[PDB]
Design a protein around this ligand. Structure first.
Ligand code: ZN
Ligand code: ZN
Ligand code: ZN
Lengths: 112, 41, 89, 158, 105, 112, 108, 113, 778
């Protein structure tokens, strides 16, 4: 579990790595992720609690990155649900690879 | 009693050189520079 | 946890560190330094030579009493070297 | 001029060396460098339990061929008298250390090694001399005048 | 016991080699192993400490009359870096339940 | 092969026998020896998460296809700098365009 | 090659109120012989149990494989049980008879 | 008293030459050979013969297993017990020094920004 | 992939950055601690008979008799104290019969606790003996089984048959592991109960702490004592949670002390403070709650005193200092809180305990309690202990107690010094060694706290000691040297002339021992012996200094801490006698030595030396080697520290204007270094200017003031705060030498250039800045 949570948290930290003064919400995100390093078991239990219960989340921001040809959707979530979802993802992919869920023909693959 | 293990596996001098995880290199920001691995002189 | 030792006042001069330097001991104030501090060598000895009366660092100066504590005559009680209610070191 | 000095020296092993380095007592027959369990060697063979190679033991009491149990070798094993020895044997002729069975790598292959038990041990009713690893092949037989039992080996197939 | 904490102040502060306090000597092979177990003998301690070198000759102090070890040995290797390695490495070791001590001489 | 020979010799492999291939191979063999390697062994699907980072994060990643932690660093440009300075006429060549001789520094070897 | 804090006693939780000691002995009986096992019969302690083995390494292999192991719908809480704490409910005594015995039989 | 005082005194030669480091002395000896190279080889470059054979190949000693790496790379003696007895300070000291090398690089990576 | 899988914690990296294990293999035995007038001679035979009846404890008896030296003073107090030592019941019987026979003869002219230690040692002799005849895994009994687990659990057989499976399990752990077995899973579609600590909030539980706090997890509520233990989980709020929860919880439990009583609290605490996973902070906080509740509870704690100390005594021996002063404080509050007889009668059985750990930390405990209740109250106990004829370990303990009393009380020992000595003296001649060693050591500690006074109280101790000085090999010798060492300053320069001159020989001979304990002792000795006013210079100059700088100055010493300091001091004093140019002249060449710590050492040494004696003694050439040494050493700085800087400043200010020819080299180095690579050395070169200001002034080098003035003026745009601060400081010091109207950067320039800097946040800038604005504004 610690392995997974660590990976996901690093991933989240990687978007802000250049780190200008950012903003308020982003500040909340860095402080909360930073919190997750100090007391991991807390974060893991809170996460599993969400996954067992909450069916209603908060509103996601949306904005368009401009490639000058086709626009790219961009979504913004509150940090709590981002850490929760992130761990959910590292875990899902891990179990998935262990159990050989995806046959080889699907190739945005880690190997190559 | 020797202390034995199957096979040999690997030494040590290297077995712990480069950082860990760390992840690539920012989302891919312009500001980063970082093209060169070692200093000039 | 922190209170005076109040052993008998000797002829040894008080020693305050950088931090405590300006403070009159009891009134906690910087005003009107007038008279001089005396504490027993039981409180001031050895590693306490030139030690701070408070924090436990080396004394860079000597404490002076205020005029306030002067008229109220508090400077004449037991040696005002604070002891923590563990040991003094 | 009988004994010049009464003490002199040794240049010899110490009991606490060999003691501390092998303890269940102190034991003999420390595993060689090769030894590895058979199941993981069936994992490098890419073999699930269906096609995997597992050595099962078979017992026949030497007087009556007519299982007290059946024993897997997959989980080396110390064949001894019973507590120290893992593979305990009720045979009263077995020395406190009788023999050992180590799977080694030459391939994952079974091996039997006598510890120099005082009586000896018979292989296919033909004994082997002490202090060398002797490969065993399937269906071979072991018995520990002093033989109260028999043993056979089987690979798992069919 | 004090040794290991000197090696930690030497590594922690970034001493960087030749200023090492094994350069205190440069003249001496013979090492001091104290706090040794009484059952031990020449061939043994030779077999354990030939690990880090080739030991030329060791005189272990054994009481003259009774003819048993007083509990320590002065050893001599063929190589100094073996001594540096041995003091800096083999120290704080358990033997027969008791932790031996080593240091130069 | 280097693993097999090491097995038969029972002696483990050193750095030097691997100094040949050290930087070579698509996995970039040196990446086995990363200190944090454990953690990364439990990371899966990283390559696709990088593909979908464009939606989570506003900025545009050109390096989306690979990641140095799983795949290593796939290029070394250190030469390009040296050859660049050579083509311009050496330190004395480039500096000849500057104020350097104004600063009256004895040498450029100490420019900081 | 073991951490010192682990002990032959394991506290086990997330148990049903119907659970049978048959399943208990069977399952836990993999790793080694049971020294014995207790189960809370009291309003707060119902759902909890303590397992004690003839050897520690038994328990070590246990918590190794039994970590988060499943029964019914539940993933059992498997922890190494502490020491001291509440003890002195019992006393130190009754040493005299047994020590007199070992002093008698073997004579030592 | 000549032969006796030469037993004790020539033992001062023996245990004196032995004391320091018999291993150390030979390495010093090799340097002496090097001086000999200088007399004939004042400024050697390349194909001159010592270099030739030089690049033309690229007393019991302990047998069993392997001896863990020693900063100074010394094979253990003949009859050595064949068991690692250590505080592990070599490895950790060995590992830590290696770690620093990684540190100098990831220190640099910082500089360009 | 399988090859990369063959190539197949960071949280354990960052989490271990929080707190630590900190501890050795010796201390971890903590984890093994489970929770809790000639008819006065013949009359001593009588009392020995009666008390022996009510066997063999020497201590209580000598405690009883210990009231005799006051004779006719003794009174009802003897009933009080002994009341705790034996059963308070028989207490009234024995003390009553004693006063009767005493008053008559004059005219005509816990047991269970100790019973446990005896059985403990006897089982130790049984097991130890058996192996000769021939640990925690030893088989157990059902009463022993009922001993561990708490209340409310049942033992079960399910079958007799499954029990027979458990019995064959041992045989089948070998047998059935060698048999057919495996596990598999099938693909099929699929309730999940669990508990955190819910109520409203209940800050989080670590996965282990569940064992302690499990009772809180169950939600059964609202139906006596069980509700007090249940509500007492406010502990959990103290341990983990937000700081406000810890505060409010802490008060709430303070005011409920008198309510809940000490029993339930300690019952629910001592397990936590005993926890193997305990933090640093959590420990300290539980220490706080123990204090705050022990400011209130007084008579209540009597049953729990030992049950407290067992956990607390490990605080006295610790690497953390604040932990130690806390521990001494709370044991002070406990002993003073409880009664004397409570403490005494409590802590006896730990004296003869097999482990020396508990003996030691127990000794420091008696030190603390003796500081609490005073020396004279506790004297007869001790004086009874050191004469105990049972076994030596006791006397060893009691003597160690004398020592730790010496360290703790220190200067305040003075009144009872005589009685204390009269106690300890009988151990110096004892057949056992330890007792002798630790004894003489305790004399040392005494004399060191005895700084000069009470010499004749040590008097009778001497003549044996000196004799021992001859015949001893090993550590005990060095110990004697420690004692005698601290003694000599207390003797008369005539008697101490002879005696000293005798000590000097052995002192010389013993420089060379590899023992570092040795070198510490003989070092401090050389300080006291050779720092004596009654010693002749030339004798030291010849006999001592060459071996002193030979063996003592080496790279073994300096890397260590205590050896570093003490070495500094001793060398300083030798300079104080033989003079300056000698010492310095010999140690200058080492300024240029490779390693830092060594350079740091000789550097601070030169600093203190030239601080005391003055630079006047120094000749010319050695002064060249000085300034060059100091610059050279200063040019390579691996760490930031004052020693090099204060060193330089003191050297220069001591040299006065003899330094003038050296300035251009100095300040050249000062500017070139004043660039280098920024953040490291800028601040340091700046500070160097700051402290060298006055010297760069009085000698009247004005060009240099132009230099520093405008050059430093230019750096005020430096973005690194830690540098800029040092810059402003340097400017400050330059203002205090050259005056207002002569400032080469006229204030019109300077001050408004300072004004915008006040936004600068980070500290040192604000400090120096505001200071300078103050000097000029004033
Ligand atoms: Zn006082
Ligand atoms: Zn202060
Ligand atoms: Zn005042």
């Amino acid at each position: 579990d610690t392995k997974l949570l660590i990976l996901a948290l690093e991933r989240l930290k990687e978007a802000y790595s250049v780190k200008s003064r950012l903003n308020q919400s982003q500040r909340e995100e860095l402080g909360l992720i930073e919190q997750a390093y100090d007391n991991p078991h807390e974060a893991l239990s809170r996460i599993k609690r969400h996954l067992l219960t909450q069916r209603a989340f908060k509103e996601v921001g949306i904005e368009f990155m401009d490639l000058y040809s086709h626009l790219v959707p961009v979504y913004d979530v509150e940090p709590l649900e981002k850490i929760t979802d992130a761990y959910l993802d590292q875990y899902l992919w891990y179990e998935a690879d262990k159990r050989r869920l995806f046959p080889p023909w699907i190739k945005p693959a880690d190997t190559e | 009693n020797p202390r034995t293990s199957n096979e040999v596996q690997y030494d040590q001098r290297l077995f712990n050189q480069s950082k860990g995880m760390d992840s690539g290199f920012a989302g891919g920001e312009d500001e980063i520079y970082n093209v060169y691995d070692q200093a000039w002189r | 946890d922190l209170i005076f030792c109040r052993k008998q006042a000797g002829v040894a001069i008080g020693r305050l560190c950088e931090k405590c330097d300006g403070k009159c001991v009891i009134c906690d104030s910087y005003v009107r330094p007038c008279t001089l501090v005396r504490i027993c060598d039981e409180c001031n000895y050895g590693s306490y030579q030139g030690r701070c009366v408070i924090c436990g660092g080396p004394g860079v100066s000597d404490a002076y009493y205020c005029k306030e504590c002067t008229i109220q005559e508090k400077d004449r009680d037991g040696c005002p070297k604070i002891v923590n209610l563990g040991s003094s070191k | 001029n009988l004994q010049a000095q009464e003490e002199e020296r040794e240049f010899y092993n110490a009991r606490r060396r060999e003691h501390r380095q092998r303890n269940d007592p102190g034991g003999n027959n420390k595993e060689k460098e090769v030894p590895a369990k058979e199941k993981p060697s069936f994992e490098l063979s890419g073999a699930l339990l269906e096609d995997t190679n597992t050595f099962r033991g078979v017992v026949i009491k030497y007087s009556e061929p007519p299982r007290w149990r059946l024993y897997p070798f997959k989980n080396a094993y110390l064949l001894g008298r019973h507590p120290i020895d893992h593979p305990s044997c009720s045979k009263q002729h077995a020395v406190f250390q009788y023999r050992l069975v180590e799977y080694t790598r030459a391939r994952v292959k079974p091996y039997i090694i006598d510890l120099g038990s005082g009586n000896g041990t018979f292989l296919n009713n033909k004994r082997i001399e002490p202090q060398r690893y002797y490969e065993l092949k399937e269906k071979d037989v072991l018995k520990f005048k002093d033989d109260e039992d028999e043993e056979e080996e089987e690979e798992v197939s069919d | 016991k004090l040794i290991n904490e000197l090696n930690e102040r030497e590594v922690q502060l970034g001493v960087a080699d030749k200023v090492s306090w094994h350069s205190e000597y440069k003249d001496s092979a013979w090492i001091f192993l104290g706090g040794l177990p009484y059952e031990l003998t020449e061939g043994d301690i030779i077999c354990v400490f030939s690990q880090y070198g080739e030991i030329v000759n060791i005189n272990l102090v054994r009481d003259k009359k009774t003819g048993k070890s007083k509990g320590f040995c002065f050893l001599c290797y063929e190589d100094q870096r073996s001594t540096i390695l041995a003091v800096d490495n083999f120290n704080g070791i358990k033997i027969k339940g008791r932790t031996i001590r080593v240091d130069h001489v | 092969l280097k693993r097999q020979e090491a097995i038969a010799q029972n002696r483990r492999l050193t750095l030097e026998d691997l100094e040949d291939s050290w930087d070579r191979g698509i996995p970039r063999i040196n990446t086995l020896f990363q200190k944090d390697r454990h953690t990364l062994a439990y990371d899966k699907g990283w390559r696709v998460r990088t593909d979908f980072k464009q939606y989570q994060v506003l900025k545009q990643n050109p390096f989306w296809w690979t990641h140095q932690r799983h795949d290593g660093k796939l290029w070394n440009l250190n030469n390009y700098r040296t050859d660049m300075i050579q083509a311009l006429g050496g330190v004395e060549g480039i500096l000849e365009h500057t104020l350097f001789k104004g600063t009256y520094f004895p040498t450029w070897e100490g420019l900081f | 090659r073991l951490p010192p804090e682990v002990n032959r006693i394991l506290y086990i939780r997330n148990l049903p109120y119907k659970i049978t000691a048959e399943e208990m002995y069977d399952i836990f009986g993999k790793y080694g012989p049971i020294r014995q096992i207790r189960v809370g019969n009291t309003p707060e302690t119902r759902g909890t149990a303590y397992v004690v083995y003839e050897d520690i390494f038994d328990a070590k292999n246990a918590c190794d494989h039994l970590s988060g192991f499943n029964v019914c719908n539940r993933y059992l809480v498997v922890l190494y049980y502490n020491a001291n704490r509440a003890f002195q409910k019992m006393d130190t005594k009754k040493k005299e008879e047994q020590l007199k015995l070992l002093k008698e039989k073997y004579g030592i | 008293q000549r032969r006796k005082a030469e037993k004790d005194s020539e033992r001062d030669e023996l245990y004196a030459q032995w004391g320091k480091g018999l291993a150390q002395s030979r390495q010093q000896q090799q340097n002496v050979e090097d001086a000999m190279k200088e007399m004939q080889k004042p400024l050697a470059r390349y194909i001159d013969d010592e270099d030739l054979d030089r690049m033309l190949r690229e007393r019991p000693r302990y047998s069993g297993p392997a001896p863990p790496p020693n900063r100074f790379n010394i094979w253990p003696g003949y009859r050595w017990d064949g068991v690692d007895r250590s505080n592990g300070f070599e490895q950790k000291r060995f590992a830590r020094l290696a770690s620093k090398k990684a540190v100098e690089e990831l220190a640099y990576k910082w500089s360009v920004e | 992939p399988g090859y990369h899988a063959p190539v197949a914690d960071p949280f354990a990296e960052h989490r271990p950055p929080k707190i630590a294990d900190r501890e050795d293999e010796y201390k971890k035995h903590r984890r093994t601690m489970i929770i809790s007038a000639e008819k006065a001679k013949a009359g001593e035979l009588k009392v020995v008979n009666g008390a022996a009846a009510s066997d063999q404890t020497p201590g209580a008896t000598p405690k009883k008799l210990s009231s005799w030296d006051q004779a006719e003073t003794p009174g009802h107090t003897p009933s009080l104290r002994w009341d705790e030592t034996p059963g308070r019941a028989k207490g009234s019987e024995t003390p009553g019969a004693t006063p009767g026979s005493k008053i008559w003869d004059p005219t005509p002219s816990a047991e269970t606790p100790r019973t446990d230690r005896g059985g403990d040692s006897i089982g130790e002799t049984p097991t130890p003996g058996a192996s000769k005849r021939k640990e925690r895994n030893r088989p157990l009994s059902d009463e022993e089984l009922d001993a561990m687990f708490p209340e409310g659990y049942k033992v079960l057989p399910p079958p007799a048959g499954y029990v027979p499976i458990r019995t064959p399990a041992r045989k089948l752990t070998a047998t059935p592991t060698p048999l057919g077995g495996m596990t598999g899973f099938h693909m099929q579609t699929e309730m999940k109960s669990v508990n955190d600590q819910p109520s409203g909030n209940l800050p989080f539980l670590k996965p282990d702490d569940i064992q302690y706090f499990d009772k809180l997890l169950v939600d059964v509520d609202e139906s006596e004592e069980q509700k007090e233990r249940k509500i007492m989980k406010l502990l959990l709020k103290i341990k983990n949670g937000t700081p406000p929860m810890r505060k409010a919880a802490l008060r709430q439990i303070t005011d409920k002390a008198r309510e809940f009583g000490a029993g339930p609290l300690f019952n629910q605490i001592l397990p936590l403070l005993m926890s193997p996973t305990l933090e640093d902070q959590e420990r300290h906080l539980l220490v706080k709650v123990i204090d705050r509740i022990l400011y209130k509870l007084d008579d209540l704690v009597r049953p729990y005193v030992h049950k407290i100390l067992v956990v607390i005594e490990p605080l006295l021996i610790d690497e953390d200092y604040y932990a130690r002063v806390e521990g001494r404080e709370i044991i002070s509050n406990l002993a003073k809180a409880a009664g004397l007889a409570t403490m005494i009668s409590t802590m006896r059985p730990d004296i003869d305990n097999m482990d020396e750990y508990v003996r030691n930390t127990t000794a420091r405990a008696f030190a603390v309690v003796a500081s609490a209740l005073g020396i004279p109250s506790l004297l007869p106990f001790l004086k009874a202990v050191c004469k105990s004829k049972k076994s030596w370990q006791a006397r060893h303990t009691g003597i160690k107690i004398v020592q730790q009393i010496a360290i703790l009380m220190g200067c305040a020992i003075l009144p009872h010094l005589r009685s204390l000595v009269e106690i300890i003296e009988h151990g110096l001649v004892d057949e056992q060694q330890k007792v002798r060693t630790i004894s003489a050591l305790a004399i040392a500690a005494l004399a060191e706290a005895a700084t000069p006074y009470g010499i004749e109280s040590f008097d009778s101790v001497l003549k044996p000691l000196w004799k021992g000085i001859r015949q001893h090999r090993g550590k005990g010798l060095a110990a004697f040297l420690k004692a005698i060492g601290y003694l000599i300053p207390l003797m008369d320069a005539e008697y101490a002339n002879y005696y000293t001159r005798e000590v000097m020989l052995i002192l010389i001979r013993e420089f060379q021992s590899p023992d570092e304990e040795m070198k510490k002792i003989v070092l401090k000795v050389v300080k006291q012996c050779c720092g004596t006013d009654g010693v002749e210079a030339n004798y030291i100059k010849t006999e001592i200094l060459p071996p002193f700088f030979k063996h003592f100055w080496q790279h073994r010493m300096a890397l260590d801490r205590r050896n570093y300091r003490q070495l500094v001091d001793t060398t300083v004093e030798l300079a104080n006698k033989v003079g300056a140019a000698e010492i310095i002249s010999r140690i200058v060449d080492d300024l240029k030595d490779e390693a830092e710590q060594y350079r740091k050492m000789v550097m601070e040494t030169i600093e203190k030396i030239m601080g005391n004696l003055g630079a006047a003694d120094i000749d010319h050439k050695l002064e060249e080697q000085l300034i060059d040494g100091i610059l050279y050493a200063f040019q390579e700085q691996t760490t930031e520290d004052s020693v090099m800087l204060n060193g330089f400043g003191t050297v220069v200010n001591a040299l006065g204007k003899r330094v003038k020819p050296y300035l251009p080299q100095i300040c050249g180095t000062v500017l070139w270094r004043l660039n280098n690579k920024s953040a490291k050395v800028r601040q340091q070169a700046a500070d160097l200017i700051s402290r060298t200001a006055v010297v760069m002034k009085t000698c009247q080098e004005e060009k240099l003031m132009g230099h520093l003035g405008v050059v430093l003026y230019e750096y005020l745009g430096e973005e690194y705060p830690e540098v800029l601060g040092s810059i402003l400081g340097a400017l400050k010091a330059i203002v205090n030498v050259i005056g207002m109207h002569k400032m080469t950067p006229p204030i019109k320039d300077l001050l408004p250039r300072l004004t915008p800097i006040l936004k600068n946040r980070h500290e040192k800038v604000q400090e120096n800045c505001i200071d300078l604005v103050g000097r000029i504004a004033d």
